[PDB]
Swiss-Prot record:
Deletion phenotype: No visible phenotype under normal growth conditions.
Record keyword Nucleotide-binding present: yes
E.C. no: 2.7.1.71
Protein known as: Shikimate kinase 2, chloroplastic
Compartment(s) of residence: Plastid, Chloroplast
Gene Ontology cellular-component annotations: chloroplast
Length: 194
C-alpha cells in the first residue's frame, strides 16, 4: 500500500510514458492487477475485451462467435490493440488470454512493456472451479497451444515464486496488491537492463 506508492514512484522515470500490457491465461488476474498498477502510476487502465464488447454496437461478442467464429473476434482484438498502441500513451491494458496468439499483436504490444502473469495451471483450474479436473483439462489443452507465446513478454511475474518468497501456502493466498508489487519489481528489473 505504501510499498506500492513507493515502487510506482521508482518506476515512473524509466517508463517515459510507455504503456504496459498484461498478458496471461484466462483467470490470471490481469484485470485486478492492472487496475492497481494503473492507479499507482496515475495511469489510465483499459480492459481490451471490455472495449471490444462496448464497440460492438447492436450485437454482442457472443453473437460474433456463433455466427463468424474465433477468427472475426481475433481481428477485433487486433483492431483494439492497434488503436491502443498508436493512440494512447501512459496506459495499462490487460488483454484476453488469446491476444498473444497473433504475431501482429506483438508488434503493437512490443511498442511498450508487456507483463505476463504466470499462474500455474492447477491454480487457474482451482480459481476457475470456485470440476477441477475438467477446468484443468481445458486449460491444459489451451496451454499446449499458447504457452510459448506468453514468454514473448518483456517481464514475467511468477505467482509461484511470490508465494515461496513470502512463505505462503498456495498461490491462492496472494493478494492483488502483492502481485502488483512483484509486477512492479520485474518491470523495473527489465527497464534497468534496457
Amino acid at each position: 500500500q505504501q510499498i506500492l506508492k513507493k515502487k510506482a514512484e521508482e518506476v515512473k522515470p524509466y517508463l517515459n510514458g510507455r504503456s504496459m500490457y498484461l498478458v496471461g491465461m484466462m483467470g490470471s488476474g490481469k484485470t485486478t492487477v492492472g487496475k492497481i498498477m494503473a492507479r499507482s502510476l496515475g495511469y489510465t487502465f483499459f480492459d481490451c475485451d471490455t472495449l471490444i464488447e462496448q464497440a460492438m454496437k447492436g450485437t454482442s461478442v457472443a453473437e460474433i462467435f456463433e455466427h463468424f467464429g474465433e477468427s472475426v473476434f481475433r481481428e477485433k482484438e487486433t483492431e483494439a490493440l492497434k488503436k491502443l498502441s498508436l493512440m494512447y500513451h501512459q496506459v495499462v491494458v490487460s488483454t484476453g488470454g488469446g491476444a498473444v496468439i497473433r504475431p501482429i499483436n506483438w508488434k503493437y504490444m512490443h511498442k511498450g512493456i508487456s507483463i505476463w502473469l504466470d499462474v500455474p495451471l492447477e491454480a487457474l483450474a482451482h480459481r476457475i472451479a470456485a470440476t477441477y479436473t475438467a477446468a484443468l483439462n481445458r486449460l491444459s489443452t489451451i496451454w499446449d497451444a499458447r504457452g510459448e507465446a506468453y514468454t514473448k513478454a518483456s517481464a514475467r511475474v511468477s505467482l509461484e515464486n511470490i508465494t515461496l518468497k513470502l512463505g505462503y501456502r498456495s498461490v491462492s493466498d496472494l493478494t492483488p496488491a502483492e502481485i502488483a508489487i512483484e509486477a512492479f519489481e520485474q518491470v523495473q528489473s527489465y527497464l534497468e537492463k534496457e
